[PDB]
Structure 1
Amino acid sequence: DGVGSSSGNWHCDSTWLGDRVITTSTRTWALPTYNNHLYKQISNGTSGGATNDNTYFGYSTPWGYFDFNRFHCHFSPRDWQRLINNNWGFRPKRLSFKLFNIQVKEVTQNEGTKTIANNLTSTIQVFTDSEYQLPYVLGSAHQGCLPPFPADVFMIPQYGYLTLNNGSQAVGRSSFYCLEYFPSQMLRTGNNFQFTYTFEDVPFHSSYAHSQSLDRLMNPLIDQYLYYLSRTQTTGGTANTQTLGFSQGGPNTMANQAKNWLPGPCYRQQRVSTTTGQNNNSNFAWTAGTKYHLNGRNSLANPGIAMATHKDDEERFFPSNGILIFGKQNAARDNADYSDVMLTSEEEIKTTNPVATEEYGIVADNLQQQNTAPQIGTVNSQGALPGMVWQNRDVYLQGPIWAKIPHTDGNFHPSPLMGGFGLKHPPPQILIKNTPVPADPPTTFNQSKLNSFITQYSTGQVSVEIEWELQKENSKRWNPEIQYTSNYYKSTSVDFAVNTEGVYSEPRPIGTRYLTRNL
C-alpha cells in the first residue's frame, strides 16, 4: 500500500456461463466536499406557493454515496440483448464492490489563478450501512448512479434523508442521524476498500410475454358440460314474459363460459393521447391524476400497480401517471417536450392484467324484481380477489434493479412498483466522505469549533461485480419469436454509441419481454 503503487485494476467485462452471467464494471468518480463539512436541517413548509402535499423535514449531510441501482450500470446494450432474447427470467445472486486508486487533491485560489495539487496525507472515509440503521435512500430512482458508458467520469451524489414532519416543523418522533457515529474505514492514497454481499432468495423476473390470455384458455372445439343463465324472457312475437333459459358455453360463446381465474387488481388511471388534439383542452395532469391519500397529503400513485398501458390498436394512449418515462439525452429537467422523453409500455400484460385506463368490470347494484329493472355498477378500483393472477411491471435497461421492502407488520406482493426486485435486506448503502482538514488554527485557544478548512476533493475508481442467475427458455413453439434487433438500414449515427461530440446516448428504452410462454 504505497504512494507509487496502483491499488486496483480496471475490471470491466461480462462472461456468460450457461446458467449465470457475471457483469463487472469500473468507473472513475469525483467527490466534492458537501455542505462545507456540515449537517444542515432542511425543511419545506406551507408558506409562499408551497402546497401541503410537498412539505417535509430532514437533514442534508456532508457525505456522498455510491449507487449502481440501474441495470445499465452493469449490462452493455449488447449484453442486455443477449439476456432478453434468450432467457425466460433472471435475478441477482451476489456482488463485489471495490474502491481503489484513491487521490485526494487540494485546490488553492489566489488572483483568479487556481492551482490543484496532491495532498498525499489526506483521507477519505467509507462505510456500509450493513445493519440498515440509516434511512434507506436508494430505490427512489434518483440520479447519480454509475454512468452507462464506461468512459464517462461521474460525480458522487450527496446523502440526505427525511423524517416525520408537521408542515415545516419536526415532531417528537423525528429522528436525527449522525453518520460519524458509525465506524468507518479511513483511506489515504494507496489504501483500498471492498466488500461482498449475497442477495436473498428472490423470484426470477419474468422476461417473457404470455402467448395466451386468461379469457382464452379453453379448447375452442368442445362445449362445456356446465350451463349458464342465457335467457330471462320469451322471444316469440309480442307476448313476451319472463322465463328461465339455460345454455352450455361453447366455441362461439367463450365470453359466457365458466372459468377458473380472474384478472389482476385494478386502480384506475386517466387516459391521455400522444396526439394532443384528442385530449381535453385543460391542464389536468395533477387535478385528474390518480393518487393515494396519506396523513393529510396526496401523492401520485406513480406508476402504481401494474396494468396494461393500452388495449389492442391503441398505442397512442397511456395512463397519465401509470408508466415509467425516461428522458432522451439532454432533455430539459422541467416541461420537456414529448419528443424529448421516452415512454415505456406494459402492453405485454394485456394478457392477464386489466388495462390501466378502463374499468375492472361490472357488478350488480341493486335487487331486480318484477317491478324493478336490474342496475349495474362500474368497478374502477379492485383489490385482491381469490382467483386472481397477474404479472408485475417489466424492468428496463435504464430502469431500477431493486428496492428495500419497508419494515412493516404486513405487505402484499412486495414487488417494487417502479419495477424490480423487492428485498428485505438489499445491497447496503455505501457512504463516502472527504475527511475535513483544518486550515491553520488560531494561535491562542478558542472553544469554538473550527470552520476554516483546506479546500479539497477526491477522485478514484470504483468496481461493481454482480453474478446473475439465468432461467433458460424451454418453448415448443414452432414459429419464430419476437426479438429485440438493431435497425437494418443506414443512419446518421449508431444507436447506443457516441456522438461526433463524444456524447453517449440511449435512443430508446429496452424492455425485457420478447420470448413467449403459455399460461
Structure 2
Amino acid sequence: GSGVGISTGGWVGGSYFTDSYVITKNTRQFLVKIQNDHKYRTENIIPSNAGGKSQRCVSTPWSYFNFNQYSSHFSPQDWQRLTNEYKRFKPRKMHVKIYNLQIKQILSNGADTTYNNDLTAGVHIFCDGEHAYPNATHPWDEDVMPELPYETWYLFQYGYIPVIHELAEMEDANAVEKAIALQIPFFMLENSDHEVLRTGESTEFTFDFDCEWINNERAYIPPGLMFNPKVPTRRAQYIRQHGNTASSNTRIQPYAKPTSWMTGPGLLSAQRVGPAGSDTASWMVVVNPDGTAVNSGMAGVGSGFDPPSGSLRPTDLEYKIQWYQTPEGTNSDGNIISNPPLSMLRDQALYRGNQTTYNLCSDVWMFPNQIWDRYPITRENPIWCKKPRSDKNTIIDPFDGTLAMDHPPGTIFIKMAKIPVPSNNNADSYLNIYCTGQVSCEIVWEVERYATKNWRPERRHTALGLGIGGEENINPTYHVDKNGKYIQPTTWDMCYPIKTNINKVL
C-alpha cells in the first residue's frame, strides 16, 4: 500500500534509442530549503560599478526546477550517438515525477547541528502550465538540473522583475513616472490552487511540445555555389567605365554564375561599451516611452542584444558566444568560445563593390531570398526559450540556438510549508525545515536517421578529440579525477556541436 515506510517510486535512468524516437530517463536528488524568510520582498539591485544600471526584483519564498539544458538529459555517450546517427531531433513529450520526499527539522544548537524528520510537515508543489506567472527560467542560467546523475540539485529561489527600475524611480515630480509605478504588477503564487505533499505522497506532471526540428545536417557548399561549372549561361553583364578602362558588355563566365540567394542577417557595426560591471553589449534595446528624465546612460534603460552577428562571421571575440563550463570559472579561465562548424550556411558575409574592390558591409538586415543555419548547439546549450506573447513578430530564430515556444514546459515551483511557532510578543518565528527528495525527468525525443548517396566517409565526433586534465593530468575529459572532480571539456569541439557530421545536398 502506501505509508511512511513505503517508497513512492524508484530510480530511473539511461537512454533508449530507436530509429523513430529516443527516450532519456533521468533521476536526481534535490534539496528544498526555506527561501527569503517565507516572505515576498521587493528589493533594489544596485551595484556600484554598473554605470547607472539598476533593477528591482520581487523575491519570493518559492523555488523552481529548471530542466532546460542538453547536458542534463543526455550523457556524453548518448549525445555522441545522437549527433552521429540522426539528422533531426525535437523534444516531443516530457514527464516529471517528484517522489520519495523527506522533510527534516534543522536543530541548530551551535557549531553542532542535528537533523530530525517531521512526518506531518509538508511541501507545496505548484506547476504553472498556462504561464499565468512571470517565467522562472531564462536560457544560459546556472540553475539547471545537474549533469552528473549522482550530484545533488539545489533549487534556486524564484524571483522576477516587475518594472524597469529607472523609469519608476520617480525622482522629484514626474507624471508618467508616477503612472508607470502605480501599474507595477505583483504576483503571489498562493492565488493558485496547488498541491501540498507529505512524506508519503508523490506527484507527476506531463508536458507536450509543439516544436520545430533541430537539424543536425551540414552544408558542404554555399547555396550560391550550386551550378554546373561547364554549362555556359545566357546571362550578360555590363561593367561601367571606370578609369582609362572602357566600358564593356559581355557574357557571364560559366564558372562565375551569379546566385539568386542571399546572406542571412546580422549586425556587425557596434562594439561593446564600458566597464564589465555594467551591462555591456554592442546593441542595446531600450524602452523609454516619453516623459521620464534621461538620468544616467542608456545602460539603465536598456537590455542589450547579443550575439548580434547571427549567421555572419564574427569579426572578433566580442561577437562570439562564450560561456563558462563551471560556476567557479572566472577571467578567461575555463571559458568555452564558440567556433565555426565549417558549415557553409552557418558563416556568411556580404561585400559591396565600389568599382575598385569589395568592402564588407557590417549591418545585414533581413532581406528576401536569405538562407542561413541556426546556431550549432552543443550539450552545453539550453534547449528552449520562452517566446514572448505579442501582436507582431518577425521570423523567430534565437541566436543562442534555442527553440522558441509559445508554451515551453511549465515551471514547477516548490516551497517549504511554513510551520509557525508560538511567540509571546508577536513576531514571525517559523520552524526551520528543509526537504530533500527525488525528481525524475523523462523526455521522449522524436528523431530521424540519415541516408546519404555520398561515397566518401563523413566527419563524426570521436573521443580522440577530447583532452586530458585533472589533478594528476592523467584523466580524460568527461571523467572524474582522484578528488571526485569531473573533468570538463576545454574547447568548443569537445562539446560535440551539431551541423558538423552529416552532409546534405542543398
User: Given the alignment of the two structures, is residue 227 of structure 1 paired with residue 225 of structure 2, yes or no?
Assistant: no
Pick aligned residue for 2:282 from 290, 303, 315: 290
Q: Is contact 2:346-2:374 (8 Å) kept? A: no
* Corresponding residue of 1:6: 7
Q: Taking structure 1 as reference, are residues 16 and 81 closer, same or farther at Cα in structure 2, changes over 3 Å only?
A: same
User: Given the alignment of the two structures, is residue 398 of structure 1 paired with residue 402 of structure 2, yes or no?
Assistant: no
* Corresponding residue of 1:482: 459
* Corresponding residue of 1:209: 218
The 3-state SS of whatever aligns with 1:36 is helix
Q: Is contact 2:271-2:281 (8 Å) kept? A: no
Pick aligned residue for 1:342 from 316, 336, 360: 336
Q: Taking structure 1 as reference, are residues 499 and 112 closer, same or farther at Cα in structure 2, changes over 3 Å only?
A: same
The 3-state SS of whatever aligns with 1:496 is coil
Instruction: Report Cα offsets for 1:235-266 as digits up to 9, x if no partner.
Output: xxxxx574442222322xx2xx3321111112
* Corresponding residue of 2:59: 60
Q: Is contact 2:219-2:344 (8 Å) kept? A: no
* Corresponding residue of 2:410: 428
Give the Cα–Cα distance (whole angstroms) in 2 for the partners of residues 190 and 294 of structure 1. Answer: 50
Give the Cα–Cα distance (whole angstroms) in 2 for the partners of residues 354 and 99 of structure 1. Answer: 46
Alpha-carbon offset, residue 374 of structure 1: 9.7
Equivalent AA in structure 1 for residue 380 of structure 2? Q
Alpha-carbon offset, residue 231 of structure 1: 5.8
Summarize the alignment of residues 235-274 of structure 1 with structure 2, pairs less than 5 Å apart: 240=244, 242-251=246-255, 254=256, 257-268=257-268
Q: Is contact 1:126-1:431 (8 Å) kept? A: yes
Summarize the alignment of residues 112-511 of structure 1 with structure 2, pairs less than 5 Å apart: 112-167=111-166, 169=169, 171-200=181-210, 202-230=211-239, 232=241, 240=244, 242-251=246-255, 254=256, 257-268=257-268, 289-295=281-287, 296=298, 297-309=301-313, 318-323=316-321, 325-329=322-326, 331-332=328-329, 334=330, 336-337=331-332, 339-351=333-345, 353-355=347-349, 360-362=350-352, 379-442=361-424, 450-487=427-464, 492-507=474-489, 508-511=494-497
* Corresponding residue of 2:292: none
Q: Is contact 1:344-1:509 (8 Å) kept? A: no
Q: Taking structure 1 as reference, are residues 375 and 396 closer, same or farther at Cα in structure 2, changes over 3 Å only?
A: closer
Instruction: Report Cα offsets for 1:446-477 as digits up to 9, x if no partner.
Output: 7x5x5101111110000000000112212111
Moved more, 346-355 or 25-34: 346-355
Provide TM-score, normalisation by structure 1: 0.84
The 3-state SS of whatever aligns with 2:435 is strand
Give the Cα–Cα distance (whole angstroms) in 2 for the partners of residues 20 and 199 of structure 1. Answer: 14
Instruction: Report Cα offsets for 1:112-160 as digits up to 9, x if no partner.
Output: 3321100111000001111111111323321121111101112111100
Alpha-carbon offset, residue 22 of structure 1: 0.4
Alpha-carbon offset, residue 349 of structure 1: 4.1
* Corresponding residue of 1:515: 502
* Corresponding residue of 1:35: 36
Give the Cα–Cα distance (whole angstroms) in 2 for the partners of residues 114 and 241 of structure 1. Answer: 90
Q: Is contact 1:327-1:340 (8 Å) kept? A: yes
Instruction: Report Cα offsets for 1:375-401 as digits up to 9, x if no partner.
Output: 998631121111111111121112100
Equivalent AA in structure 2 for residue 306 of structure 1? G
Q: Taking structure 1 as reference, are residues 270 and 481 closer, same or farther at Cα in structure 2, changes over 3 Å only?
A: farther
Q: Is contact 1:402-1:421 (8 Å) kept? A: yes
Q: Taking structure 1 as reference, are residues 199 and 287 closer, same or farther at Cα in structure 2, changes over 3 Å only?
A: closer
* Corresponding residue of 2:96: 97
Q: Is contact 1:146-1:154 (8 Å) kept? A: yes
Alpha-carbon offset, residue 215 of structure 1: 2.9
Q: Taking structure 1 as reference, are residues 300 and 509 closer, same or farther at Cα in structure 2, changes over 3 Å only?
A: farther
Moved more, 26-35 or 450-459: 450-459
* Corresponding residue of 2:175: none
Equivalent AA in structure 1 for residue 3 of structure 2? G
The 3-state SS of whatever aligns with 1:105 is strand
Q: Is contact 1:65-1:430 (8 Å) kept? A: yes
Q: Is contact 2:306-2:319 (8 Å) kept? A: yes
Q: Is contact 1:165-1:171 (8 Å) kept? A: no
* Corresponding residue of 1:313: none
The 3-state SS of whatever aligns with 2:415 is strand
Equivalent AA in structure 2 for residue 108 of structure 1? L
The 3-state SS of whatever aligns with 2:132 is coil
The 3-state SS of whatever aligns with 1:85 is helix
Instruction: Report Cα offsets for 1:24-50 as digits up to 9, x if no partner.
Output: 1000011110011011102235x8544
Q: Is contact 1:329-1:505 (8 Å) kept? A: no
Q: Is contact 1:363-1:379 (8 Å) kept? A: no
Give the Cα–Cα distance (whole angstroms) in 2 for the partners of residues 269 and 463 of structure 1. Answer: 46
The 3-state SS of whatever aligns with 2:342 is helix
Alpha-carbon offset, residue 305 of structure 1: 4.8
Give the Cα–Cα distance (whole angstroms) in 2 for the partners of residues 496 and 242 of structure 1. Answer: 64
The 3-state SS of whatever aligns with 1:84 is helix
Q: Taking structure 1 as reference, are residues 377 and 409 closer, same or farther at Cα in structure 2, changes over 3 Å only?
A: farther
Give the Cα–Cα distance (whole angstroms) in 1 for the partners of residues 408 and 386 of structure 2. Answer: 6
Give the Cα–Cα distance (whole angstroms) in 2 for the partners of residues 181 and 288 of structure 1. Answer: 38
Give the Cα–Cα distance (whole angstroms) in 2 for the partners of residues 4 and 99 of structure 1. Answer: 17
TM-align CA RMSD = 2.8
User: Please, which runs of 5 or more residues in structure 1 have no aligned partner?
Assistant: 235-239, 273-281, 311-316, 365-372
Percent identity over the alignment is 25
Alpha-carbon offset, residue 223 of structure 1: 1.7
Give the Cα–Cα distance (whole angstroms) in 2 for the partners of residues 411 and 350 of structure 1. Answer: 27
Number of residue pairs aligned between Structure 1 and Structure 2 = 471
* Corresponding residue of 2:295: none
The 3-state SS of whatever aligns with 1:487 is helix
Q: Taking structure 1 as reference, are residues 61 and 321 closer, same or farther at Cα in structure 2, changes over 3 Å only?
A: farther
Give the Cα–Cα distance (whole angstroms) in 2 for the partners of residues 133 and 288 of structure 1. Answer: 31
Give the Cα–Cα distance (whole angstroms) in 2 for the partners of residues 500 and 60 of structure 1. Answer: 39
Give the Cα–Cα distance (whole angstroms) in 2 for the partners of residues 287 and 43 of structure 1. Answer: 16
Q: Is contact 1:342-1:509 (8 Å) kept? A: no
* Corresponding residue of 2:173: none
Alpha-carbon offset, residue 419 of structure 1: 1.4
Q: Is contact 1:21-1:470 (8 Å) kept? A: yes
Give the Cα–Cα distance (whole angstroms) in 2 for the partners of residues 321 and 376 of structure 1. Answer: 22
Give the Cα–Cα distance (whole angstroms) in 1 for the partners of residues 418 and 428 of structure 2. Answer: 10
Equivalent AA in structure 1 for residue 348 of structure 2? P
Q: Is contact 1:227-1:247 (8 Å) kept? A: yes
Moved more, 190-199 or 290-299: 290-299
Give the Cα–Cα distance (whole angstroms) in 2 for the partners of residues 488 and 164 of structure 1. Answer: 47
Q: Is contact 2:269-2:363 (8 Å) kept? A: no
- Kindly name which structure, 1 or 2, has the bigger radius of gyration based on alpha carbons: 1
Q: Taking structure 1 as reference, are residues 300 and 293 closer, same or farther at Cα in structure 2, changes over 3 Å only?
A: closer
Q: Taking structure 1 as reference, are residues 243 and 398 closer, same or farther at Cα in structure 2, changes over 3 Å only?
A: closer
Give the Cα–Cα distance (whole angstroms) in 1 for the partners of residues 270 and 102 of structure 2. Answer: 52
